[PDB]
Amino acid sequence: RDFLQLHRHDSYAPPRPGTLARWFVNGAGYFAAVADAILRAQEEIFITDWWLSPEVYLKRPAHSDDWRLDIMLKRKAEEGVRVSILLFKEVELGINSGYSKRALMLLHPNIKVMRHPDQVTLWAHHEKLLVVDQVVAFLGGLDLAYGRWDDLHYRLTDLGDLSHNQFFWLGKDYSNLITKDWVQLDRPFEDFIDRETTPRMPWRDVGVVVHGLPARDLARHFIQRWNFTKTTKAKYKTPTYPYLLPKSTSTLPGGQCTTVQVLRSVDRWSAGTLENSILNAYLHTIRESQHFLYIENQFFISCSDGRTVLNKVGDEIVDRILKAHKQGWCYRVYVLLPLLPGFEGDISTGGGNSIQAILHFTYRTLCRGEYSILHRLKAAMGTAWRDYISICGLRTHGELGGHPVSELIYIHSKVLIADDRTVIIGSANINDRSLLGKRDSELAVLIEDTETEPSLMNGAEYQAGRFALSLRKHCFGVILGPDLDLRDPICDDFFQLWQDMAESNANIYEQIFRCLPSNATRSLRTLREYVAVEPLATVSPPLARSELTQVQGHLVHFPLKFLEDESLLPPGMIPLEVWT
């Protein structure tokens, strides 16, 4: 189909029936499949990244230079494949796009990198994309960067010429984003945190590969950005940065047949044109949902006031719940968020001002003030709001230094599932920065099942979509931990079990580790005395170990009262839309 007019959800690309698509949870399988695809490239590789670590390993553990990203691209370039890479040019953030650019172009003349933007701005190129030969395209929340690789084990430790290497995270790849931001990226194989005393922060994310026409559509987005970027400065206008051109005619892992529509957020500054079809698809999917939403997202900043926060995703969720309550429907909203935002800040001191600013807008969406979801639900239905929405985070535990240690699982995903039939996967967080179009550039795909499987929905027989059901079950299974019945995602028994597990795990983790965030620290003054206590994990490792046997899965209740007596906004000159 065509690109002369806009399509459903005001997207530049139409929905593509009969598309083979496969989802990925966590970087391990996504980065492996990226590696397989790079290896089979014959003509072109397109890559967009907010951050690209050239020396990251795509398969683990590394035993040689094979599967190292820079080596793989250099080998393909040496066979004649053209590699075109668009990197975000940060305001010297610490991702060091200058080192990434010089390193990638040193590999081979067939590899060309452009960075953008040159002008000072608050916004970023946020999309993560890799397209091979305009026919296979990977996108989602995972950059080809340090700290992203993980698997279902969510290992907190990594204790074991690379011929005898047993580490899964070499050098700068072993990191705890909350503990310390990356330094010295030109020394990639050097540690910057203490492996024997400081645990890893596990990274959870969702990606997707699509084949055929939607991969062509994603290639067309890259090409539009590439040719637009060429015109942005003199060095890039020269023929050494070739114009790219889309394949027009005749458009592999184990995927599922689905209908896929590409969506994006772009503006004049970031591309040639304006679009906010990710937002439109989010709103419409919520509006038309009938049974449940599953939201796993790094951010949750919404509920418009017309001034500070503008996107209406939260408002659509509220309206949907209020309608279900008015009609007597069984309807559930599952929200999975990182327990703490992903910036370097000592949470035992209260978090940095960046963390506190994000916490302000997160809690403003969830439960604090006239616009919050919980306040508007309570106004209509009182304490019944708990039957309709559950806000949770993830946590795991392990052993280091002879005693249990614990860390949150960083929810970096940007995924929505509706009704076991529809999925949105992309780079777009739920905040104004990702969704308005005018700010960060973003990509997503809307994946609608055309093939179904018998399942259940509040006890009734229900034809669920194959792609959506397998993903939703895979999420639930890992989060909850054998004899579990995951067929019905909304019946009372399952929702009760979900809430009971979230609370039970949260209680145990608080009993053993006194981990933050917590409902027990409503102010900074009570936080200061709360962290002054040694947790049982180190006081008595045997007692701690015994109690940790009662933790099931990783699901923990999201504490809605953490620092609720503090203003959490900084007094400072940064415009507030940096955080929204």
PDB file of all heavy atoms in Angstrom, residues 39-72:
ATOM      1  N   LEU A  39      24.274 -11.304  10.538  1.00  0.00           N
ATOM      2  CA  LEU A  39      25.074 -12.293   9.826  1.00  0.00           C
ATOM      3  C   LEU A  39      24.515 -12.601   8.438  1.00  0.00           C
ATOM      4  O   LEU A  39      25.286 -12.891   7.514  1.00  0.00           O
ATOM      5  CB  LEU A  39      25.163 -13.570  10.668  1.00  0.00           C
ATOM      6  CG  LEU A  39      26.503 -14.293  10.811  1.00  0.00           C
ATOM      7  CD1 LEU A  39      27.637 -13.305  11.008  1.00  0.00           C
ATOM      8  CD2 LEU A  39      26.434 -15.275  11.978  1.00  0.00           C
ATOM      9  N   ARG A  40      23.196 -12.549   8.256  1.00  0.00           N
ATOM     10  CA  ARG A  40      22.612 -12.906   6.966  1.00  0.00           C
ATOM     11  C   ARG A  40      22.368 -11.702   6.059  1.00  0.00           C
ATOM     12  O   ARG A  40      21.820 -11.866   4.964  1.00  0.00           O
ATOM     13  CB  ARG A  40      21.316 -13.694   7.168  1.00  0.00           C
ATOM     14  CG  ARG A  40      21.511 -14.983   7.959  1.00  0.00           C
ATOM     15  CD  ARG A  40      20.209 -15.756   8.122  1.00  0.00           C
ATOM     16  NE  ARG A  40      19.936 -16.080   9.521  1.00  0.00           N
ATOM     17  CZ  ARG A  40      18.863 -16.745   9.942  1.00  0.00           C
ATOM     18  NH1 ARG A  40      17.957 -17.165   9.067  1.00  0.00           N
ATOM     19  NH2 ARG A  40      18.694 -16.992  11.235  1.00  0.00           N
ATOM     20  N   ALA A  41      22.779 -10.504   6.476  1.00  0.00           N
ATOM     21  CA  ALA A  41      22.585  -9.319   5.650  1.00  0.00           C
ATOM     22  C   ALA A  41      23.353  -9.435   4.336  1.00  0.00           C
ATOM     23  O   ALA A  41      24.499  -9.900   4.298  1.00  0.00           O
ATOM     24  CB  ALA A  41      23.024  -8.066   6.409  1.00  0.00           C
ATOM     25  N   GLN A  42      22.698  -9.023   3.244  1.00  0.00           N
ATOM     26  CA  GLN A  42      23.290  -9.072   1.914  1.00  0.00           C
ATOM     27  C   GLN A  42      23.476  -7.710   1.261  1.00  0.00           C
ATOM     28  O   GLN A  42      24.316  -7.595   0.361  1.00  0.00           O
ATOM     29  CB  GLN A  42      22.441  -9.941   0.970  1.00  0.00           C
ATOM     30  CG  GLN A  42      22.266 -11.377   1.422  1.00  0.00           C
ATOM     31  CD  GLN A  42      23.572 -12.133   1.472  1.00  0.00           C
ATOM     32  OE1 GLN A  42      24.219 -12.347   0.443  1.00  0.00           O
ATOM     33  NE2 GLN A  42      23.973 -12.548   2.674  1.00  0.00           N
ATOM     34  N   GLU A  43      22.734  -6.685   1.682  1.00  0.00           N
ATOM     35  CA  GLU A  43      22.780  -5.399   0.994  1.00  0.00           C
ATOM     36  C   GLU A  43      22.939  -4.226   1.955  1.00  0.00           C
ATOM     37  O   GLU A  43      23.818  -3.379   1.760  1.00  0.00           O
ATOM     38  CB  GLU A  43      21.516  -5.206   0.153  1.00  0.00           C
ATOM     39  CG  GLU A  43      21.322  -6.265  -0.923  1.00  0.00           C
ATOM     40  CD  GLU A  43      19.872  -6.418  -1.351  1.00  0.00           C
ATOM     41  OE1 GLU A  43      18.988  -5.814  -0.705  1.00  0.00           O
ATOM     42  OE2 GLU A  43      19.621  -7.140  -2.341  1.00  0.00           O
ATOM     43  N   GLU A  44      22.091  -4.159   2.983  1.00  0.00           N
ATOM     44  CA  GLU A  44      21.967  -2.973   3.817  1.00  0.00           C
ATOM     45  C   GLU A  44      21.650  -3.369   5.250  1.00  0.00           C
ATOM     46  O   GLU A  44      20.916  -4.329   5.507  1.00  0.00           O
ATOM     47  CB  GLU A  44      20.859  -2.005   3.308  1.00  0.00           C
ATOM     48  CG  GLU A  44      20.976  -1.564   1.835  1.00  0.00           C
ATOM     49  CD  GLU A  44      19.835  -0.638   1.372  1.00  0.00           C
ATOM     50  OE1 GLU A  44      18.711  -1.134   1.138  1.00  0.00           O
ATOM     51  OE2 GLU A  44      20.061   0.587   1.238  1.00  0.00           O
ATOM     52  N   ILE A  45      22.202  -2.601   6.187  1.00  0.00           N
ATOM     53  CA  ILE A  45      21.816  -2.659   7.590  1.00  0.00           C
ATOM     54  C   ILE A  45      21.546  -1.229   8.033  1.00  0.00           C
ATOM     55  O   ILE A  45      22.413  -0.358   7.883  1.00  0.00           O
ATOM     56  CB  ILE A  45      22.903  -3.318   8.463  1.00  0.00           C
ATOM     57  CG1 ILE A  45      23.145  -4.759   8.006  1.00  0.00           C
ATOM     58  CG2 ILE A  45      22.495  -3.314   9.959  1.00  0.00           C
ATOM     59  CD1 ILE A  45      24.329  -5.453   8.730  1.00  0.00           C
ATOM     60  N   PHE A  46      20.337  -0.973   8.529  1.00  0.00           N
ATOM     61  CA  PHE A  46      19.958   0.329   9.078  1.00  0.00           C
ATOM     62  C   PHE A  46      19.859   0.215  10.588  1.00  0.00           C
ATOM     63  O   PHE A  46      19.237  -0.724  11.095  1.00  0.00           O
ATOM     64  CB  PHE A  46      18.604   0.824   8.567  1.00  0.00           C
ATOM     65  CG  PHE A  46      18.518   1.007   7.097  1.00  0.00           C
ATOM     66  CD1 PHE A  46      17.271   1.190   6.493  1.00  0.00           C
ATOM     67  CD2 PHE A  46      19.654   1.009   6.303  1.00  0.00           C
ATOM     68  CE1 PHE A  46      17.168   1.357   5.119  1.00  0.00           C
ATOM     69  CE2 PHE A  46      19.548   1.180   4.933  1.00  0.00           C
ATOM     70  CZ  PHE A  46      18.309   1.349   4.345  1.00  0.00           C
ATOM     71  N   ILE A  47      20.434   1.184  11.303  1.00  0.00           N
ATOM     72  CA  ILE A  47      20.456   1.161  12.766  1.00  0.00           C
ATOM     73  C   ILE A  47      20.170   2.563  13.287  1.00  0.00           C
ATOM     74  O   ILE A  47      20.845   3.519  12.887  1.00  0.00           O
ATOM     75  CB  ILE A  47      21.809   0.667  13.317  1.00  0.00           C
ATOM     76  CG1 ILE A  47      22.194  -0.680  12.698  1.00  0.00           C
ATOM     77  CG2 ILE A  47      21.756   0.570  14.853  1.00  0.00           C
ATOM     78  CD1 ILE A  47      23.545  -1.215  13.171  1.00  0.00           C
ATOM     79  N   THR A  48      19.173   2.691  14.167  1.00  0.00           N
ATOM     80  CA  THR A  48      18.968   3.891  14.973  1.00  0.00           C
ATOM     81  C   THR A  48      19.121   3.516  16.434  1.00  0.00           C
ATOM     82  O   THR A  48      18.656   2.453  16.860  1.00  0.00           O
ATOM     83  CB  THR A  48      17.573   4.539  14.813  1.00  0.00           C
ATOM     84  OG1 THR A  48      16.550   3.629  15.242  1.00  0.00           O
ATOM     85  CG2 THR A  48      17.303   4.992  13.407  1.00  0.00           C
ATOM     86  N   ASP A  49      19.732   4.408  17.203  1.00  0.00           N
ATOM     87  CA  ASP A  49      19.941   4.153  18.614  1.00  0.00           C
ATOM     88  C   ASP A  49      19.979   5.474  19.357  1.00  0.00           C
ATOM     89  O   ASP A  49      20.504   6.467  18.848  1.00  0.00           O
ATOM     90  CB  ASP A  49      21.243   3.376  18.850  1.00  0.00           C
ATOM     91  CG  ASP A  49      21.026   1.871  18.883  1.00  0.00           C
ATOM     92  OD1 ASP A  49      20.324   1.376  19.796  1.00  0.00           O
ATOM     93  OD2 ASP A  49      21.565   1.183  17.988  1.00  0.00           O
ATOM     94  N   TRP A  50      19.410   5.469  20.559  1.00  0.00           N
ATOM     95  CA  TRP A  50      19.668   6.538  21.509  1.00  0.00           C
ATOM     96  C   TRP A  50      21.079   6.416  22.068  1.00  0.00           C
ATOM     97  O   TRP A  50      21.779   7.419  22.245  1.00  0.00           O
ATOM     98  CB  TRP A  50      18.627   6.488  22.623  1.00  0.00           C
ATOM     99  CG  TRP A  50      18.786   7.544  23.660  1.00  0.00           C
ATOM    100  CD1 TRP A  50      18.391   8.850  23.569  1.00  0.00           C
ATOM    101  CD2 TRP A  50      19.376   7.391  24.950  1.00  0.00           C
ATOM    102  NE1 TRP A  50      18.702   9.518  24.725  1.00  0.00           N
ATOM    103  CE2 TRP A  50      19.308   8.646  25.591  1.00  0.00           C
ATOM    104  CE3 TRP A  50      19.968   6.317  25.626  1.00  0.00           C
ATOM    105  CZ2 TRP A  50      19.798   8.853  26.878  1.00  0.00           C
ATOM    106  CZ3 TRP A  50      20.445   6.522  26.910  1.00  0.00           C
ATOM    107  CH2 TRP A  50      20.359   7.783  27.520  1.00  0.00           C
ATOM    108  N   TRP A  51      21.522   5.186  22.311  1.00  0.00           N
ATOM    109  CA  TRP A  51      22.883   4.896  22.742  1.00  0.00           C
ATOM    110  C   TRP A  51      23.319   3.591  22.096  1.00  0.00           C
ATOM    111  O   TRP A  51      22.587   2.597  22.134  1.00  0.00           O
ATOM    112  CB  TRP A  51      22.979   4.802  24.271  1.00  0.00           C
ATOM    113  CG  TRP A  51      24.358   4.512  24.800  1.00  0.00           C
ATOM    114  CD1 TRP A  51      25.551   4.747  24.173  1.00  0.00           C
ATOM    115  CD2 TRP A  51      24.684   3.947  26.076  1.00  0.00           C
ATOM    116  NE1 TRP A  51      26.594   4.360  24.977  1.00  0.00           N
ATOM    117  CE2 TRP A  51      26.087   3.863  26.150  1.00  0.00           C
ATOM    118  CE3 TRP A  51      23.921   3.505  27.166  1.00  0.00           C
ATOM    119  CZ2 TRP A  51      26.745   3.350  27.271  1.00  0.00           C
ATOM    120  CZ3 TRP A  51      24.577   2.991  28.277  1.00  0.00           C
ATOM    121  CH2 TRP A  51      25.971   2.921  28.320  1.00  0.00           C
ATOM    122  N   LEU A  52      24.496   3.607  21.481  1.00  0.00           N
ATOM    123  CA  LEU A  52      25.090   2.427  20.872  1.00  0.00           C
ATOM    124  C   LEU A  52      26.461   2.224  21.496  1.00  0.00           C
ATOM    125  O   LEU A  52      27.326   3.104  21.397  1.00  0.00           O
ATOM    126  CB  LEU A  52      25.203   2.586  19.354  1.00  0.00           C
ATOM    127  CG  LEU A  52      25.392   1.325  18.510  1.00  0.00           C
ATOM    128  CD1 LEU A  52      24.886   1.569  17.103  1.00  0.00           C
ATOM    129  CD2 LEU A  52      26.847   0.900  18.474  1.00  0.00           C
ATOM    130  N   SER A  53      26.651   1.074  22.151  1.00  0.00           N
ATOM    131  CA  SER A  53      27.948   0.693  22.684  1.00  0.00           C
ATOM    132  C   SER A  53      28.615  -0.202  21.648  1.00  0.00           C
ATOM    133  O   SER A  53      28.171  -1.348  21.469  1.00  0.00           O
ATOM    134  CB  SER A  53      27.813  -0.044  24.019  1.00  0.00           C
ATOM    135  OG  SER A  53      27.148   0.744  24.991  1.00  0.00           O
ATOM    136  N   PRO A  54      29.652   0.262  20.958  1.00  0.00           N
ATOM    137  CA  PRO A  54      30.201  -0.536  19.845  1.00  0.00           C
ATOM    138  C   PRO A  54      30.701  -1.907  20.258  1.00  0.00           C
ATOM    139  O   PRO A  54      30.519  -2.872  19.511  1.00  0.00           O
ATOM    140  CB  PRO A  54      31.333   0.353  19.309  1.00  0.00           C
ATOM    141  CG  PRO A  54      30.950   1.747  19.736  1.00  0.00           C
ATOM    142  CD  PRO A  54      30.296   1.579  21.077  1.00  0.00           C
ATOM    143  N   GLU A  55      31.289  -2.038  21.448  1.00  0.00           N
ATOM    144  CA  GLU A  55      31.911  -3.282  21.867  1.00  0.00           C
ATOM    145  C   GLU A  55      30.966  -4.206  22.633  1.00  0.00           C
ATOM    146  O   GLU A  55      31.438  -5.151  23.273  1.00  0.00           O
ATOM    147  CB  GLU A  55      33.152  -2.983  22.713  1.00  0.00           C
ATOM    148  CG  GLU A  55      34.243  -2.231  21.961  1.00  0.00           C
ATOM    149  CD  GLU A  55      34.026  -0.722  21.943  1.00  0.00           C
ATOM    150  OE1 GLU A  55      33.136  -0.232  22.678  1.00  0.00           O
ATOM    151  OE2 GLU A  55      34.747  -0.026  21.192  1.00  0.00           O
ATOM    152  N   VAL A  56      29.650  -3.975  22.572  1.00  0.00           N
ATOM    153  CA  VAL A  56      28.723  -4.859  23.281  1.00  0.00           C
ATOM    154  C   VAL A  56      28.680  -6.217  22.585  1.00  0.00           C
ATOM    155  O   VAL A  56      28.798  -6.325  21.354  1.00  0.00           O
ATOM    156  CB  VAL A  56      27.313  -4.237  23.396  1.00  0.00           C
ATOM    157  CG1 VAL A  56      26.552  -4.288  22.075  1.00  0.00           C
ATOM    158  CG2 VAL A  56      26.508  -4.926  24.515  1.00  0.00           C
ATOM    159  N   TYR A  57      28.550  -7.272  23.384  1.00  0.00           N
ATOM    160  CA  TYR A  57      28.473  -8.631  22.869  1.00  0.00           C
ATOM    161  C   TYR A  57      27.015  -9.026  22.689  1.00  0.00           C
ATOM    162  O   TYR A  57      26.196  -8.828  23.592  1.00  0.00           O
ATOM    163  CB  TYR A  57      29.188  -9.609  23.798  1.00  0.00           C
ATOM    164  CG  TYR A  57      30.676  -9.582  23.609  1.00  0.00           C
ATOM    165  CD1 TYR A  57      31.489  -8.827  24.445  1.00  0.00           C
ATOM    166  CD2 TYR A  57      31.272 -10.288  22.569  1.00  0.00           C
ATOM    167  CE1 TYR A  57      32.858  -8.786  24.259  1.00  0.00           C
ATOM    168  CE2 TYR A  57      32.636 -10.251  22.372  1.00  0.00           C
ATOM    169  CZ  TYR A  57      33.426  -9.502  23.221  1.00  0.00           C
ATOM    170  OH  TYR A  57      34.790  -9.464  23.032  1.00  0.00           O
ATOM    171  N   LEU A  58      26.693  -9.577  21.522  1.00  0.00           N
ATOM    172  CA  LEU A  58      25.315  -9.937  21.217  1.00  0.00           C
ATOM    173  C   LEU A  58      24.956 -11.344  21.656  1.00  0.00           C
ATOM    174  O   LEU A  58      23.764 -11.641  21.812  1.00  0.00           O
ATOM    175  CB  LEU A  58      25.049  -9.785  19.718  1.00  0.00           C
ATOM    176  CG  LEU A  58      25.282  -8.364  19.199  1.00  0.00           C
ATOM    177  CD1 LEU A  58      24.780  -8.211  17.767  1.00  0.00           C
ATOM    178  CD2 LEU A  58      24.594  -7.366  20.112  1.00  0.00           C
ATOM    179  N   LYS A  59      25.953 -12.202  21.862  1.00  0.00           N
ATOM    180  CA  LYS A  59      25.780 -13.531  22.429  1.00  0.00           C
ATOM    181  C   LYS A  59      26.774 -13.692  23.570  1.00  0.00           C
ATOM    182  O   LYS A  59      27.882 -13.152  23.509  1.00  0.00           O
ATOM    183  CB  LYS A  59      25.988 -14.619  21.374  1.00  0.00           C
ATOM    184  CG  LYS A  59      25.046 -14.505  20.193  1.00  0.00           C
ATOM    185  CD  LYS A  59      24.919 -15.831  19.477  1.00  0.00           C
ATOM    186  CE  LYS A  59      23.982 -15.711  18.277  1.00  0.00           C
ATOM    187  NZ  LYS A  59      23.656 -17.049  17.698  1.00  0.00           N
ATOM    188  N   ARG A  60      26.376 -14.422  24.612  1.00  0.00           N
ATOM    189  CA  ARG A  60      27.096 -14.475  25.876  1.00  0.00           C
ATOM    190  C   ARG A  60      27.231 -15.913  26.353  1.00  0.00           C
ATOM    191  O   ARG A  60      26.349 -16.737  26.098  1.00  0.00           O
ATOM    192  CB  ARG A  60      26.371 -13.665  26.965  1.00  0.00           C
ATOM    193  CG  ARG A  60      25.857 -12.294  26.542  1.00  0.00           C
ATOM    194  CD  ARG A  60      26.951 -11.263  26.569  1.00  0.00           C
ATOM    195  NE  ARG A  60      26.521  -9.952  26.076  1.00  0.00           N
ATOM    196  CZ  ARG A  60      26.154  -8.930  26.844  1.00  0.00           C
ATOM    197  NH1 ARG A  60      26.150  -9.045  28.168  1.00  0.00           N
ATOM    198  NH2 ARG A  60      25.802  -7.780  26.282  1.00  0.00           N
ATOM    199  N   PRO A  61      28.321 -16.243  27.074  1.00  0.00           N
ATOM    200  CA  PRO A  61      29.431 -15.342  27.417  1.00  0.00           C
ATOM    201  C   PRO A  61      30.430 -15.214  26.276  1.00  0.00           C
ATOM    202  O   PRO A  61      30.623 -16.151  25.502  1.00  0.00           O
ATOM    203  CB  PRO A  61      30.074 -16.008  28.649  1.00  0.00           C
ATOM    204  CG  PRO A  61      29.596 -17.426  28.649  1.00  0.00           C
ATOM    205  CD  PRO A  61      28.540 -17.608  27.584  1.00  0.00           C
ATOM    206  N   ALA A  62      31.058 -14.050  26.169  1.00  0.00           N
ATOM    207  CA  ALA A  62      32.038 -13.837  25.117  1.00  0.00           C
ATOM    208  C   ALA A  62      33.267 -14.709  25.352  1.00  0.00           C
ATOM    209  O   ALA A  62      33.803 -14.767  26.464  1.00  0.00           O
ATOM    210  CB  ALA A  62      32.430 -12.365  25.056  1.00  0.00           C
ATOM    211  N   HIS A  63      33.706 -15.402  24.305  1.00  0.00           N
ATOM    212  CA  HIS A  63      34.947 -16.158  24.345  1.00  0.00           C
ATOM    213  C   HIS A  63      35.958 -15.681  23.319  1.00  0.00           C
ATOM    214  O   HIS A  63      37.092 -16.176  23.319  1.00  0.00           O
ATOM    215  CB  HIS A  63      34.679 -17.653  24.131  1.00  0.00           C
ATOM    216  CG  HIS A  63      33.867 -18.279  25.225  1.00  0.00           C
ATOM    217  ND1 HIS A  63      34.362 -18.487  26.494  1.00  0.00           N
ATOM    218  CD2 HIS A  63      32.591 -18.735  25.241  1.00  0.00           C
ATOM    219  CE1 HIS A  63      33.431 -19.051  27.243  1.00  0.00           C
ATOM    220  NE2 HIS A  63      32.347 -19.212  26.507  1.00  0.00           N
ATOM    221  N   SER A  64      35.586 -14.731  22.469  1.00  0.00           N
ATOM    222  CA  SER A  64      36.405 -14.224  21.379  1.00  0.00           C
ATOM    223  C   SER A  64      35.746 -12.948  20.865  1.00  0.00           C
ATOM    224  O   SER A  64      34.776 -12.453  21.449  1.00  0.00           O
ATOM    225  CB  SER A  64      36.545 -15.265  20.265  1.00  0.00           C
ATOM    226  OG  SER A  64      35.289 -15.476  19.632  1.00  0.00           O
ATOM    227  N   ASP A  65      36.260 -12.429  19.749  1.00  0.00           N
ATOM    228  CA  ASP A  65      35.698 -11.244  19.110  1.00  0.00           C
ATOM    229  C   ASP A  65      34.401 -11.530  18.362  1.00  0.00           C
ATOM    230  O   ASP A  65      33.687 -10.588  18.013  1.00  0.00           O
ATOM    231  CB  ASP A  65      36.714 -10.632  18.138  1.00  0.00           C
ATOM    232  CG  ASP A  65      37.784  -9.832  18.847  1.00  0.00           C
ATOM    233  OD1 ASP A  65      37.543  -9.424  20.004  1.00  0.00           O
ATOM    234  OD2 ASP A  65      38.865  -9.618  18.252  1.00  0.00           O
ATOM    235  N   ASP A  66      34.093 -12.794  18.091  1.00  0.00           N
ATOM    236  CA  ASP A  66      32.815 -13.127  17.487  1.00  0.00           C
ATOM    237  C   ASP A  66      31.673 -12.643  18.371  1.00  0.00           C
ATOM    238  O   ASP A  66      31.768 -12.627  19.604  1.00  0.00           O
ATOM    239  CB  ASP A  66      32.698 -14.636  17.277  1.00  0.00           C
ATOM    240  CG  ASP A  66      33.799 -15.192  16.404  1.00  0.00           C
ATOM    241  OD1 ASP A  66      34.268 -14.474  15.495  1.00  0.00           O
ATOM    242  OD2 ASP A  66      34.201 -16.349  16.633  1.00  0.00           O
ATOM    243  N   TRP A  67      30.584 -12.250  17.720  1.00  0.00           N
ATOM    244  CA  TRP A  67      29.343 -11.761  18.305  1.00  0.00           C
ATOM    245  C   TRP A  67      29.503 -10.396  18.960  1.00  0.00           C
ATOM    246  O   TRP A  67      28.524  -9.868  19.501  1.00  0.00           O
ATOM    247  CB  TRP A  67      28.733 -12.751  19.310  1.00  0.00           C
ATOM    248  CG  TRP A  67      28.685 -14.156  18.790  1.00  0.00           C
ATOM    249  CD1 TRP A  67      29.339 -15.244  19.303  1.00  0.00           C
ATOM    250  CD2 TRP A  67      27.942 -14.633  17.658  1.00  0.00           C
ATOM    251  NE1 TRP A  67      29.050 -16.366  18.561  1.00  0.00           N
ATOM    252  CE2 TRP A  67      28.193 -16.020  17.547  1.00  0.00           C
ATOM    253  CE3 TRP A  67      27.087 -14.024  16.728  1.00  0.00           C
ATOM    254  CZ2 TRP A  67      27.623 -16.807  16.542  1.00  0.00           C
ATOM    255  CZ3 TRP A  67      26.518 -14.812  15.727  1.00  0.00           C
ATOM    256  CH2 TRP A  67      26.790 -16.187  15.647  1.00  0.00           C
ATOM    257  N   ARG A  68      30.689  -9.797  18.918  1.00  0.00           N
ATOM    258  CA  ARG A  68      30.831  -8.408  19.320  1.00  0.00           C
ATOM    259  C   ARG A  68      30.287  -7.519  18.214  1.00  0.00           C
ATOM    260  O   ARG A  68      30.614  -7.705  17.039  1.00  0.00           O
ATOM    261  CB  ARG A  68      32.283  -8.064  19.616  1.00  0.00           C
ATOM    262  CG  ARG A  68      32.416  -7.051  20.726  1.00  0.00           C
ATOM    263  CD  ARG A  68      33.860  -6.849  21.112  1.00  0.00           C
ATOM    264  NE  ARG A  68      34.490  -5.871  20.232  1.00  0.00           N
ATOM    265  CZ  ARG A  68      35.773  -5.539  20.278  1.00  0.00           C
ATOM    266  NH1 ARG A  68      36.577  -6.113  21.167  1.00  0.00           N
ATOM    267  NH2 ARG A  68      36.248  -4.635  19.431  1.00  0.00           N
ATOM    268  N   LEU A  69      29.449  -6.555  18.594  1.00  0.00           N
ATOM    269  CA  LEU A  69      28.671  -5.820  17.607  1.00  0.00           C
ATOM    270  C   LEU A  69      29.567  -5.134  16.580  1.00  0.00           C
ATOM    271  O   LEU A  69      29.309  -5.205  15.372  1.00  0.00           O
ATOM    272  CB  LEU A  69      27.776  -4.802  18.308  1.00  0.00           C
ATOM    273  CG  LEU A  69      27.068  -3.769  17.436  1.00  0.00           C
ATOM    274  CD1 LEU A  69      26.090  -4.420  16.463  1.00  0.00           C
ATOM    275  CD2 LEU A  69      26.354  -2.772  18.342  1.00  0.00           C
ATOM    276  N   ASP A  70      30.622  -4.458  17.044  1.00  0.00           N
ATOM    277  CA  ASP A  70      31.473  -3.720  16.119  1.00  0.00           C
ATOM    278  C   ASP A  70      32.157  -4.667  15.142  1.00  0.00           C
ATOM    279  O   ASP A  70      32.225  -4.385  13.939  1.00  0.00           O
ATOM    280  CB  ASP A  70      32.496  -2.877  16.888  1.00  0.00           C
ATOM    281  CG  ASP A  70      33.442  -3.714  17.753  1.00  0.00           C
ATOM    282  OD1 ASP A  70      33.072  -4.831  18.168  1.00  0.00           O
ATOM    283  OD2 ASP A  70      34.565  -3.239  18.023  1.00  0.00           O
ATOM    284  N   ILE A  71      32.618  -5.819  15.634  1.00  0.00           N
ATOM    285  CA  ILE A  71      33.267  -6.807  14.777  1.00  0.00           C
ATOM    286  C   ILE A  71      32.282  -7.366  13.756  1.00  0.00           C
ATOM    287  O   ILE A  71      32.630  -7.570  12.588  1.00  0.00           O
ATOM    288  CB  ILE A  71      33.882  -7.925  15.641  1.00  0.00           C
ATOM    289  CG1 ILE A  71      34.820  -7.327  16.692  1.00  0.00           C
ATOM    290  CG2 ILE A  71      34.636  -8.932  14.772  1.00  0.00           C
ATOM    291  CD1 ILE A  71      35.944  -6.500  16.099  1.00  0.00           C
ATOM    292  N   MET A  72      31.047  -7.633  14.177  1.00  0.00           N
ATOM    293  CA  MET A  72      30.070  -8.196  13.251  1.00  0.00           C
ATOM    294  C   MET A  72      29.748  -7.222  12.123  1.00  0.00           C
ATOM    295  O   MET A  72      29.679  -7.620  10.952  1.00  0.00           O
ATOM    296  CB  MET A  72      28.798  -8.586  13.999  1.00  0.00           C
ATOM    297  CG  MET A  72      28.994  -9.658  15.077  1.00  0.00           C
ATOM    298  SD  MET A  72      27.390 -10.313  15.593  1.00  0.00           S
ATOM    299  CE  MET A  72      26.996 -11.350  14.186  1.00  0.00           C
TER     300      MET A  72
END
